[PDB]
Amino acid sequence: FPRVKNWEVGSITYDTLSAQAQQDGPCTPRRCLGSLVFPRPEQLLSQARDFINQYYSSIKRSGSQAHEQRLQEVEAEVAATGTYQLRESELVFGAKQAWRNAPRCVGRIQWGKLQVFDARDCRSAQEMFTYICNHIKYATNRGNLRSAITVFPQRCPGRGDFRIWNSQLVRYAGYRQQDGSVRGDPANVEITELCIQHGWTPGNGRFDVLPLLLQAPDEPPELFLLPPELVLEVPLEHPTLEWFAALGLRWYALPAVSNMLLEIGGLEFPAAPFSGWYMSTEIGTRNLCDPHRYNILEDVAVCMDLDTRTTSSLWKDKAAVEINVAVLHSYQLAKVTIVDHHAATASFMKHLENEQKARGGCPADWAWIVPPISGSLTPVFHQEMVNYFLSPAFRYQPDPW
Amino acid sequence: FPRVKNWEVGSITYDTLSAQAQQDGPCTPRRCLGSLVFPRAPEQLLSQARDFINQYYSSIKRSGSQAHEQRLQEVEAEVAATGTYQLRESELVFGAKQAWRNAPRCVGRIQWGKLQVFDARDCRSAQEMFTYICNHIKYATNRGNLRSAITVFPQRCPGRGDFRIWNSQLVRYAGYRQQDGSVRGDPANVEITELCIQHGWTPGNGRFDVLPLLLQAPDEPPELFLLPPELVLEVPLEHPTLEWFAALGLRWYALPAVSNMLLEIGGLEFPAAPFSGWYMSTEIGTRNLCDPHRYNILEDVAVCMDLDTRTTSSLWKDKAAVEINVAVLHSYQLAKVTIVDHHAATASFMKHLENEQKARGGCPADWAWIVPPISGSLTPVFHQEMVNYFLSPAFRYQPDPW
Ligand code: HEM
Ligand code: HEM
Ligand SMILES: CN(C)CCc1cc(F)c(F)c(CCc2cc(C(F)F)cc(N)n2)c1
Ligand SMILES: CN(C)CCc1cc(F)c(F)c(CCc2cc(C(F)F)cc(N)n2)c1
Ligand SMILES: C[C@H](O)[C@H](O)[C@H]1CNc2nc(N)[nH]c(=O)c2N1
Ligand SMILES: C[C@H](O)[C@H](O)[C@H]1CNc2nc(N)[nH]c(=O)c2N1
Ligand SMILES: [Cl-]
Ligand SMILES: [Cl-]
Ligand SMILES: [Gd]
Ligand SMILES: [Gd]
Ligand SMILES: [Zn+2]
């Protein structure tokens, strides 16, 4: 069992949970591939059986009547239909465990509080749209954000897939110009061109909220314009730098991942959007300052009158900290839930300790738990971590085109 | 072959060199252990040696030649006769450079070919060892214009114990367990400090007392040697616009000189081969001064800066850390001691990656050690996927000799 050391304190633990690793990952004794983002018939019963045993142990009901019982109906359901339906409580328990198991999520101290909307009787793109709209309004909650997930019908053979084509529920547009370069978000250029292709009237701005492309099975996608009063956004200002507001920067309140695939007990939900609240460095450091994203770092440094002529003035570092300061200040002033990377990582250290006593370990992806600014200033930096795959899980999935 | 993306540009390469990785690391398809700091007969000596000679003869564009097969047969005959073999001098220079080139956690490897190799394989005693080390320090420091170098002491061999430098670096500050429970000085060096005192060193009581050297000749107890103060170049730390910073009394030393790692060349082992370069400012500014278990100055700096330390969301920690790094850079530049910042360092490592892809079809890199400890995604290496694996020649960790 792997020895895991914390270098700030000197404490040691052993990850015994690592034994249960289902889907083998990308690494071999010959080379480590841990830094790679994407690492390149009736077996349905194996995963269903084990998931059901998970559920009943977690309610202290292993080896007792209702557990014995439930094992048989899944047997008979697959015997008859080739698949099975999840009990409500199980679907809820499975959604929370997928989150709990996500190795790259630093927010997992919250995994126990998740609102699960059952949209398994969904039947059309227009139905999806109102399901998604209930979620958003519920999650957003006038800025007192509440974690939530909506689970659309599980995939079945011979029939089309429910899919959301946008990577998130809120995405800004990305437009090319008379010179190739991009106005707006360069991460969403591809999806912006799909939305225009399917009938959307493109705006002229740098923060145009894209419309949703929702895919009912075996039909094409359909464009859905989001109600603007339902997309809560935060104009960005700085507490002491009065010109920052004039830069016109904005970001949205609800981070809502709408392209990942929920797998519970061998069942696959290709449309299962989940949402929580942002950590400030996601917006301030990655979204606004990545060179391939909004790339605002030099513009803010000019306004701060910084010496951009030498890298050793650390002008980049100074401008980045102030951009994060403005994000936190803005979200707080607008009363929108947000968490800074110091509070977030301290909470994750507490999650690690809980998980050690509860399950004997915790799958964690060091490169993604450590924040993208001030890494060694947070406690997770000095914490050794073990990465592996447990089920149920959120999985990446191909684009439906 | 593993495919490797640069997420900032869209670049894609394939690490074909990883397939030749001989020795194994800690990961499996079950679980990744990349974040662990310490992830760890004549026939097998023969095959390592054979592979190294092949490497050397490739480098001098003489692969397969007369001299190449001569040297292969020579080494096997010497392994048969003596159980070991001896490197020629040029083979030792080439192997020391490759060992730096192959070090996956080193961001300064653009410089790998510019390495001064001192051959001390004739060294006889701890006293001679000390003389060689002082000459190494003098040459590398070079009055603040630092030069990369390595001194190679005699190889491990059966029948005799190893040369060992007990100190983890040639320049270290003492750490004295205090009155209450605190450490005065560098807490990372409590153990080695205690070892020096128990070997007859008279301690000081400052925060920046330079430690003596404990030097081990074969089958000898370690022997204490003091470094002449004028050999150890140091830099008082000041801040360009925070004049109270000078009153903190902080200093750091010019020469980073790792002295406790094992150099492996073609199966041969050099347990004592100290090497030195120059610092990147975040090792001093972020790790050495701001780590909670090191000098831990962050809160004191932020309080002096009049930051609000009662709430995390004011980003006082980030603000104070940026200014500590400014101070380190400004102080080394003022003092005319070589130093590189994490933006320039990570950008020349990107060129290294590119040179290495052309030269060898990839480059072993340990992402979590390459990405700087502050302002990570502001540097280009953050957005570069990397493949970590073990190539030989190599610097390896080894157990402490006590
Ligand atoms: C409640 C507060 C939450 C915070 C502060 C938070 C924060 C983060 C951050 C910073 C990442 C880094 C991934 C990246 O940069 O791409 C991440 C990943 C992830 N989170 Fe959370 N998250 C929260 C809630 C949730 C919820 C409710 C779920 C699911 C029910 C979830 C599931 C995931 C998954 C699957 C990933 C990996 C996705 C990827 O890396 O592409 N998180 N989270
Ligand atoms: C010339 C300037 C150099 C710079 C700027 C530099 C930079 C760095 C940095 C920042 C690290 C990681 C530090 C840490 O442990 O936190 C590192 C590690 C390392 N460097 Fe370099 N280095 C330089 C020269 C050299 C030389 C000359 C050698 C050997 C010939 C070398 C071999 C290594 C090795 C083996 C490691 C890994 C040690 C470990 O595991 O911590 N470096 N370097
Ligand atoms: C890596 N970044 C820079 C690119 C954009 C990006 C790519 C992803 F794959 C991705 F999942 C995300 C959101 C992660 C996330 C998810 C959640 C949850 F509640 F929904 C909350 C939160 N705070 N963050 C963002
Ligand atoms: C948390 N850190 C401090 C770990 C301690 C530590 C362990 C090591 F093995 C190690 F080599 C170092 C220095 C790396 C280094 C080496 C060199 C070279 F010229 F010698 C130059 C440079 N700039 N840096 C530090
Ligand atoms: C636990 C974690 O892997 C450990 O603290 C590592 C992370 N990355 C690092 N990177 C460098 N350059 N030096 C270090 O000491 C570390 N420490
Ligand atoms: C190459 C590297 O692994 C990759 O760019 C990762 C590193 N860690 C990350 N961590 C988060 N949270 N988001 C990211 O996009 C990345 N990028
Ligand atoms: Cl985002
Ligand atoms: Cl150091
Ligand atoms: Gd001005
Ligand atoms: Gd001043
Ligand atoms: Zn790995």
Written in H, E and C, the secondary structure of A276-302 is CCCEHHHHHHHHHHCCCCCCCHHHHHH
Residues of chain A with CATH 3.90.440.10: 121-146+161-232+396-400
Backbone angles phi, psi at A121, to 5 degrees: -90, 20
The packing angle between helices A44-58 and A88-101, to 10°, is: 90
> Hunting for tokens 């956004």 — which residue is that?
A233
| β-pair partners for A215 | A163, A221
Please choose, from the candidates A334, A335, A330, A321, the residue with its C-alpha nearest in 3D space to the C-alpha of residue A237: A330
Restricting to B residues 359-398, those with a Cβ less than 8 Å away from any Cβ of A are 366-368, 371-378, 382-383, 385-389
- In CATH, what class is B15-121+148-158+262-276+346-370? alpha beta
Residues of chain B with CATH 3.90.440.10: 122-147+162-233+397-401
Please choose, from the candidates A226, A222, A215, the residue with its C-alpha nearest in 3D space to the C-alpha of residue A199: A222
Collect all residues with Cβ–Cβ distance below 8 Å to A56 and sequence separation of at least 6: A62, A64, A66, A67, A70
Q: Which of B375, B384, B388 to mutate to test the interface with A (most CBs of A within 10 A)?
A: B375
Residues of chain A with CATH 3.90.1230.10: 233-255+278-343
Residues of chain B with CATH 3.90.1230.10: 234-256+279-344
- In CATH, the architecture of A121-146+161-232+396-400 is Alpha-Beta Complex (3.90)
Residue to mutate, A108, A282, A348, ligand 3, most ligand atoms under 8 Å from C-beta: A282
Q: What is d(CA A43, CA A13) in angstroms, rounded to the nearest whole number?
A: 35
Helix, strand, coil percentages in chain B from 3-state DSSP, rounded to 5: 40, 15, 45
Helices (H) and strands (E) in chain A, counts: 11, 16
CA of B3 to the centre of ligand 4 (A): 29
Sheet-wide strand order for B394-396: B268-270, B262-265, B394-396
Please choose, from the candidates B128, B210, B201, the residue with its C-alpha nearest in 3D space to the C-alpha of residue B175: B210
Cα B256 to the center of its chain, rounded Å? 8
Pairing mode, if any, of strands B262-265 and B268-270?
antiparallel
Please, how many CA atoms are within 13 Å of residue B211, restricted to the half-sphere of its CB? 28
CB A160 within 8 A of CB A183: no
CATH superfamily of B234-256+279-344: Nitric Oxide Synthase; Chain A, domain 3 (3.90.1230.10)
Which two tokens mark A124?
Answer: 């059309």
Cα A98 to the center of its chain, rounded Å? 11
CB B150 within 8 A of CB B115: yes
In this structure, the number of other CB atoms found within 10 A of the CB of residue A143 comes to: 16
Which two tokens mark A79?
Answer: 């015997």
CB B393 within 8 A of CB B96: yes
Pairing mode, if any, of strands B234-236 and A163-164?
unpaired
Restricting to B residues 255-314, those with a Cβ less than 8 Å away from any Cβ of A are 281, 286-287, 290-293, 298, 312-314
Collect all residues with Cβ–Cβ distance below 8 Å to B37 and sequence separation of at least 6: A5, A7, A384
Please, how many CA atoms are within 13 Å of residue B6, restricted to the half-sphere of its CB? 13
- In CATH, the architecture of A15-120+147-157+261-275+345-369 is Alpha-Beta Complex (3.90)
Please choose, from the candidates B331, B300, B125, B369, the residue with its C-alpha nearest in 3D space to the C-alpha of residue B233: B331
Residues of chain A with CATH 3.90.340.10: 15-120+147-157+261-275+345-369
Closest chain B residue to the Cα of A328, Cα to Cα: B313
Which two tokens mark B105?
Answer: 């956690």
- Is the distance from the beta carbon of residue A186 to the nearest atom of ligand 3 less than 6 Å? no
- Looking at the domain B122-147+162-233+397-401, which fold is it? Nitric Oxide Synthase;Heme Domain; Chain A, domain 2 (3.90.440)
Work out the burial of residue A351: count CB atoms within 10 Å of its CB; fewer than 13 is exposed, 13-18 middle, 19 or more buried. Answer: buried
Q: What is d(CA A259, CA A264) in angstroms, rounded to the nearest whole number?
A: 16
**What kind of experiment solved this structure?**
X-ray
Element of type H or E holding A214: strand A212-215
| β-pair partners for B280 | B340
Element of type H or E holding A67: helix A65-81
Q: Which of B333, B376, B385 sits opposite A375 (nearest CB)?
A: B376
CB B261 within 8 A of CB B268: no
Q: What is d(CA B200, CA B203) in angstroms, rounded to the nearest whole number?
A: 9
CA of B244 to the centre of ligand 10 (A): 8
- The answer to whether B112 is a known ligand-binding residue is no
Torsion, Cα of A41, A45, A46, A50 (10° steps): 160
Q: What is d(CA B402, CA A399) in angstroms, rounded to the nearest whole number?
A: 57
Q: CA angle, B324 as apex, B321 and B329 as ends, to 5°? A: 130
- Cβ contact A375–B378 (<8 Å): no
Backbone angles phi, psi at B210, to 5 degrees: -70, 130
Q: Which of A28, A32, A317 sits opposite B378 (nearest CB)?
A: A317
Helix, strand, or coil (residue A183): strand
Q: CA angle, A298 as apex, A294 and A299 as ends, to 5°? A: 75
- The answer to whether A367 is a known ligand-binding residue is yes
Q: What is d(CA B213, CA B274) in angstroms, rounded to the nearest whole number?
A: 13
Looking at residue B286, the DSSP 8-state letter turns out to be I
Which two tokens mark B178?
Answer: 């205090």
Q: What is d(CA B219, CA B32) in angstroms, rounded to the nearest whole number?
A: 40
- Looking at the domain A233-255+278-343, which fold is it? 3.90.1230
Q: What is d(CA A322, CA A317) in angstroms, rounded to the nearest whole number?
A: 9
- The answer to whether B287 is a known ligand-binding residue is yes
Cis peptide, bond prior to residue A291, ω within 30 of zero = no
> Hunting for tokens 């330079």 — which residue is that?
B210
Pairing mode, if any, of strands B116-119 and B149-152?
parallel
Q: What is d(CA B88, CA A171) in angstroms, rounded to the nearest whole number?
A: 63
Please choose, from the candidates A396, A400, A366, the residue with its C-alpha nearest in 3D space to the C-alpha of residue A98: A396
The packing angle between helices B42-59 and B89-101, to 10°, is: 90
Q: What is d(CA A356, CA A354) in angstroms, rounded to the nearest whole number?
A: 5
